[PDB]
Ligand binder design. Structure first.
Ligand SMILES: *[C@@H]1O[C@H](CO)[C@@H](O[C@@H]2O[C@H](CO)[C@@H](O[C@@H]3O[C@H](CO)[C@@H](O)[C@H](O)[C@@H]3O)[C@H](O)[C@H]2NC(C)=O)[C@H](O)[C@H]1NC(C)=O
Ligand SMILES: *[C@@H]1O[C@H](CO)[C@@H](O)[C@H](O)[C@H]1NC(C)=O
Ligand SMILES: *[C@@H]1O[C@H](CO)[C@@H](O)[C@H](O)[C@H]1NC(C)=O
Ligand SMILES: *[C@@H]1O[C@H](CO)[C@@H](O)[C@H](O)[C@H]1NC(C)=O
Ligand SMILES: *[C@@H]1O[C@H](CO)[C@@H](O)[C@H](O)[C@H]1NC(C)=O
Ligand SMILES: [Ca+2]
Ligand SMILES: [Ca+2]
Ligand SMILES: [Ca+2]
Length: 1131
């Protein structure tokens, strides 16, 4: 139940108990709020006697103003409409500005006419003490003045609740001294439609209100409409709702547009862009506007059902607009963004100090000093790009790439070596660019950057300092080994190694691709070079921040700047010269943007001016086809290039051999691989040519293993420069000419120092070596080391969607992202498409924009039967599900493990951590905030409208269960969130405290599951949380990481007496003294057979920390009394 008080009419009031009167004040009087423990207060602002604005104050800190013309303020600043915040979801319900606070309990509406409203909860029975009268069934005692004296004059009682504020003084409001046939409202007691209500609230007070209005009622046929509408609303709230009224004489309650004032319009209000979530429309009917019928409510006005625009990247799109992604394209069907399914060309950017972007985008930093295999065909060896990395800037965390050694085997056996400084060394001797061959076309670019180009499949962009940009066509598809990983479009597996197993650590994966056996394997890959050079932190942050500024806002939606921001920070803190490396990082992000399709200037005086040579000009977005006298000499070769942003020359000019461009029609006449000056006639025995313009117009020691050095024929044999070790036997070793050293017998590889047979050499996993025939367990799969290669058993294991922290999620395929949501979102769901759905898990929360101490997650599990809502700290089942057979509520440890079906095994932390575990059955059939469980991480941001979104914010906003609540604003901030950014003191302590994840206790597990996602989740969600007393915000993240570790059989006992202590004393506390049975076990077992659950169950998680009773062998545990007793004393 709930009461209702409305400041309807013109200066009228209706208390919570029915008493009504007139009062035109000016001092923003207190409508409702307890007088003992206020904790919040609805204030009805008044202007010159008119009802202007309805304010709500929470405690003494949060101020919200609603106004009657739709504008909103926080007290000193304006805000947009949906404006979800700490409670107080201010929305538009049915054309009326609704302000809903449920944690406290009330709902404030302001319809077009300006009639306020309030729906206080029963828990304020006899407790509210505002201007709307105390909420007691007795309606005659609703003039309780703030002084505590019950008066009879309404104006005295009303003025006793005035609330002045600073400039807004006030005085005793007094009734206007104005005195006085439209008898229309007499029908309140005559017409049948109203007559039905007579058993309910009587009309006589409303007839008196008529007479009072009618006395003046300045206007025409309006003296009655306010009272009639108020009576109808009061009757509807009291029970039955007057159907059919407003068809006789009412003023047609105003609506913004699409005039459809309709009694009992469901607030669910299926709108234009909604997920069609049925069964959540349980909210009671409320009188309000609506769309005519066939129309559907769009963002603003009503539009036709067949006109719903598609939404992508947080903007609207008329049907059929069909914008194009990188290489695929979408069509914008009826809000479905049907998209193509081609394969785009890959790229393996290697820019920066040590930064890689695998073909399947897997931004990572390795920083190893050796020769590493970047990309290779493997399936059909046709190119073996290899990089040689060497430390720069006399700092450990600075490992540039010095050269590249492409090994195109098609052209006999070429060894094109893109040297430092943009030189090329085809098979030893340097070569004068441009160069042509069978298909090789290495040549300069507009910028000083060699561009190797094989037969329209390879395309490199070496640039000297180091920028390799290997680009492959879809032909190579999923056949490409090397540091760029298989080019199969899935970013998850791009950490594979020659042994055939993905390395969880970047270091192991990188070391796997060594060529020289003597190079040092990389240890922990430091993430913060700034720590070694503190003087650079300020400049690094303040300079790389530009990547997250309006200058790059256009590209922000196309390419997420986070990896590029991290790379810029690392380079600036690590590079030898801050200026050049900063410009390189910014140019890298800009180039990524431009290649995606968006061009950003980002180049300003001082910052990164290109400073083109005299005679050249910058002209961002220039054309490269022309701008070479050679181009004139060969005017029918090709032109299929685009904007390059290089240093071109003024129109009408032409690059010459020397480099200048003053030549316009005085150009060399490149011909037969020779240079001819202008007008250089020439006549051989079978032709005669003259060079005009630019075109050459023409007519007519240690036994027992054998020792060999090399044949020394042309320095081809493999000397000691590369000795085939089983760790690198498969890899293509570099060829630096014969060194004339030792070598193992041809039919067996080297190992350590003793040469051993190839079939007998251990594989590797996490650095550790495993001898042939051994085996290792990965998840629910086991692998055996054979021929230095892992043979794994393929059983797709259960995927675990999670919501680490409050703003971070972990998809089934493994993607982790940030989404600070407030509304109710679809965590998991199988109502994706043609497949008939079976369940929907919604993870709606409250006050969780910024992860806060009071944030709480409300999970509603709409299984086939009905809601299984989880809230607070216990499970509620507000529906008997159709098949209660498959339903358990095992609450081992601190968790509420559920088994809602054969596969669905939701695991709950009794707090803000929720895990959904699915089996092979729900593969590629699920959708929501946790991807689709297809094994591909890239396609896990697919929005509700079946399009991939770069920014996780838009993708999350696409999954809100409602469609009017609010959309999380795309915050451009970076690491060090708001409460973390400008604190330093809090930033540092948070960073240090959220480092236990890398402590010794977690050290054993860190090598099995990287903590960086959880490090971020802890640095975030801990600065955001103002943990006071309740220290769960920080502790919960660590506990979640420990739980993940335990899932991998790496139990960690990290809790202490001073670090997130967890006690169990209260359980053992019993009338019999002390039981000593309930103790905290860091891991504990899974669901334990108990009196209420004698039979065993297949729990999703084998181990779960928390309290548990270590009962002796007999007398298994009970449930109600939380004590273990003989099996007899239970059912
Ligand atoms: C809905 O009603 C509210 C309440 O009247 C309107 O707020 C008022 O908006 C006007 C528009 O500019 C404000 O005028 C400006 O005030 C500032 C500060 O006093 C002054 O420096 C300017 O020169 C200008 O006069 C006015 O202050 C403001 N009153 C408030 C906030 O109490 C609101 O504009 C209305 N909605 C719409 C859409 O108009
Ligand atoms: C209102 O409060 C007073 C004192 O707390 C109490 O005596 C009285 O019974 C209350 N009224 C109702 C209806 O509970
Ligand atoms: C170069 O190409 C541009 C674009 O097609 C064209 O306008 C121009 O005439 C060409 N020649 C020169 C010398 O710029
Ligand atoms: C896996 O083992 C089976 C049985 O020994 C064998 O037939 C199969 O070839 C093995 N797979 C690989 C990739 O070696
Ligand atoms: C937790 O329980 C398991 C199995 O019951 C046991 O092996 C382990 O020693 C326990 N740990 C502690 C700290 O009691
Ligand atoms: Ca009362
Ligand atoms: Ca891949
Ligand atoms: Ca997927």
């Amino acid at each position: 139940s709930t009461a209702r008080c409305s400041l309807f009419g013109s200066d009228f009031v209706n208390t919570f108990d029915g008493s009504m009167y007139s009062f035109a004040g000016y001092c923003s009087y207190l409508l409702a709020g307890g007088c003992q423990k206020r904790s919040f207060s609805i204030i009805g602002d008044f202007q010159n006697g008119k009802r202007v604005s309805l304010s709500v104050y929470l405690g003494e800190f949060f101020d919200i103003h609603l106004f009657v013309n739709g504008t909103v303020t926080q007290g000193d600043q304006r805000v947009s409409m949906p404006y979800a915040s700490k409670g107080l979801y201010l929305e538009t319900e049915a054309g009326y500005y609704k302000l809903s606070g449920e944690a406290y309990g009330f709902v404030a509406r302001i319809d077009g006419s300006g009639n306020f409203q309030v729906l206080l909860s029963d828990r304020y029975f006899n407790k509210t003490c505002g201007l709307c009268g105390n909420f007691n069934i007795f309606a005659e005692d609703d003039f309780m003045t703030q002084e505590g004296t019950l008066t009879s004059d309404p104006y005295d009682f009303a003025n006793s609740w005035a609330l002045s504020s600073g400039e807004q003084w006030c005085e005793r409001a007094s009734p206007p001294s104005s005195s006085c046939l439209w008898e229309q409202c007499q029908l309140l007691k005559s017409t049948s439609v109203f007559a039905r209500c007579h058993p309910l609230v009587d009309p006589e007070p409303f007839v008196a209100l008529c007479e009072k209005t009618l006395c003046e009622c300045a206007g025409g046929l309006e003296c009655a409409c306010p009272a009639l509408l108020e009576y109808a609303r009061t009757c509807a709230q009291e029970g039955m709702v007057l159907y059919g009224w407003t068809d006789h004489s009412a003023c047609s309650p105003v609506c913004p547009a699409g005039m459809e004032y309709r009694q009992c319009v469901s607030p669910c209000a299926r709108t234009c862009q909604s997920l069609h979530i049925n069964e959540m429309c349980q909210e009671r009917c409320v009188d309000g506007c609506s769309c005519p019928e066939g129309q559907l409510l769009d963002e603003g006005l009503c539009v036709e059902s067949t006109e719903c625009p598609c939404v992508h990247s947080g903007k609207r799109y008329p049907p059929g607009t069909s914008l194009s992604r990188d290489c695929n394209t979408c069509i914008c069907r009826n809000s479905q963004w049907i998209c193509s399914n081609e394969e785009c060309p890959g790229e393996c950017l290697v820019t920066g100090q040590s930064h890689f972007k695998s073909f399947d985008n897997r931004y990572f930093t390795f920083s190893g000093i050796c020769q590493y295999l970047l990309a290779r065909d493997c399936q059909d060896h046709s190119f073996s790009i290899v990089i040689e990395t060497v430390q720069c800037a006399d700092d450990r965390d600075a490992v540039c790439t010095r050269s590249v050694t492409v090994r195109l085997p098609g052209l006999h056996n070429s060894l094109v070596k893109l040297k430092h400084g943009a030189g090329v060394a085809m098979d030893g001797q340097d070569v004068q660019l441009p160069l042509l061959k069978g298909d090789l076309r290495i040549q300069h670019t507009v910028t000083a950057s060699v561009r190797l180009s094989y037969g329209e499949d390879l395309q490199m962009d070496w640039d000297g300092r180091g920028r390799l940009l290997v680009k492959l066509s879809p032909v190579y598809a999923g056949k490409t080994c090397g540091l760029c990983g298989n080019y199969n479009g899935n970013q998850g597996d791009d950490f594979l190694t020659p042994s055939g197993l993905a390395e969880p650590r970047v270091e192991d994966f990188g070391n796997a691709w060594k060529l020289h056996g003597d190079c040092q394997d990389l240890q922990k890959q430091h993430s913060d070079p700034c720590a070694l050079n503190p003087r650079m932190t300020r400049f690094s942050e303040e300079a790389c921040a530009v990547l997250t500024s309006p200058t790059f806002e256009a590209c922000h939606r196309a390419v997420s700047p986070l990896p590029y921001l991290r790379n810029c920070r690392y380079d600036v803190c690590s590079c030898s010269d801050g200026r050049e490396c900063l410009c390189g990082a910014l140019a890298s992000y800009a180039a990524a943007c431009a290649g995606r399709g968006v061009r950003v200037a980002w180049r300003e005086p001082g910052r990164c001016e290109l400073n083109c040579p005299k005679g050249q000009v910058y002209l961002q977005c220039g054309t490269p086809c022309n701008l070479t006298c050679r181009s004139l000499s060969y005017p029918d070769e090709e032109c299929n290039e685009a904007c390059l942003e290089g240093c071109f020359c003024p129109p009408g000019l032409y690059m010459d051999e020397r480099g200048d461009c003053v030549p316009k029609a005085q150009c060399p006449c490149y011909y037969d691989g020779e240079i001819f000056q202008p007008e250089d006639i020439f006549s051989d025995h079978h032709t005669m040519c003259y060079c005009e313009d630019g075109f050459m117009h023409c007519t007519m020691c240690r036994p027992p293993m054998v020792k060999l050095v090399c044949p020394a024929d042309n320095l081809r044999a493999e000397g000691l420069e590369c000795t085939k070790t089983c760790q690198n036997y498969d890899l293509e070793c570099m060829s630096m000419g014969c060194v004339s050293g030792c070598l193992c017998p041809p039919g067996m590889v080297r190992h350590e120092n003793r040469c051993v047979a190839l079939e007998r050499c251990p594989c590797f996993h996490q650095g550790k070596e495993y001898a042939p025939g051994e085996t290792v367990k990965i998840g629910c799969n086991t692998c055996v080391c054979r021929d230095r290669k892992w043979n794994c058993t393929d059983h797709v294991c259960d995927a675990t969607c999670s919501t680490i922290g409050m703003a971070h999620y972990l998809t089934f395929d493994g993607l982790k992202y940030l989404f600070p949501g407030e509304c109710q979102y679809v965590l998991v769901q199988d109502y994706c498409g043609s497949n008939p759905g079976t369940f929907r898990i919604l993870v709606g929360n409250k006050g969780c924009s910024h992860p806060s101490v009071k944030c709480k997650k409300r999970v509603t599990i709409l299984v086939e039967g009905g809601e299984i809502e989880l809230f607070d700290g216990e499970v509620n089942v507000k529906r008997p599900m159709k098949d209660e057979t498959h339903f358990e509520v095992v609450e081992s440890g601190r968790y509420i493990i559920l088994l809602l079906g054969k596969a669905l095994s939701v695991v709950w932390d009794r707090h803000l951590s929720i895990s959904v575990v699915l089996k092979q059955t729900y593969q590629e059939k699920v959708c929501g905030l946790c991807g689709n469980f297809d094994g591909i991480q890239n396609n896990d941001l697919t929005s509700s409208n079946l399009q991939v979104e770069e920014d996780p914010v838009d993708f999350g906003n696409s999954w809100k269960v409602s469609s009017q609540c609010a959309d999380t604003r795309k915050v451009p901030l970076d690491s060090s969130p708001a409460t973390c950014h400008n604190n330093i003191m809090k930033q540092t302590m948070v960073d240090s405290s959220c480092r236990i994840l890398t402590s010794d206790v977690f050290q054993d597990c860190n090598k099995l599951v990287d903590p960086e996602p959880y490090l971020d989740v802890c640095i975030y969600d801990t600065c955001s949380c103002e943990s006071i007393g309740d220290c769960a915000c920080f502790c919960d993240t660590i506990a979640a990481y420990a739980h993940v570790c335990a899932q991998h059989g790496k139990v960690v006992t990290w809790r202490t007496a001073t670090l997130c202590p967890q006690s169990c004393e209260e359980r053992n506390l019993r009338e019999n003294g002390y039981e000593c049975e309930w103790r905290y076990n860091s891991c504990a077992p899974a669901c334990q057979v108990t009196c209420q659950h004698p039979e065993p169950l297949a729990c999703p998680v084998q181990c779960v920390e928390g309290c548990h009773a270590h009962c002796p062998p007999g007398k298994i545990l009970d449930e109600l009394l939380q004590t273990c007793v003989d099996p007899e004393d239970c059912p």
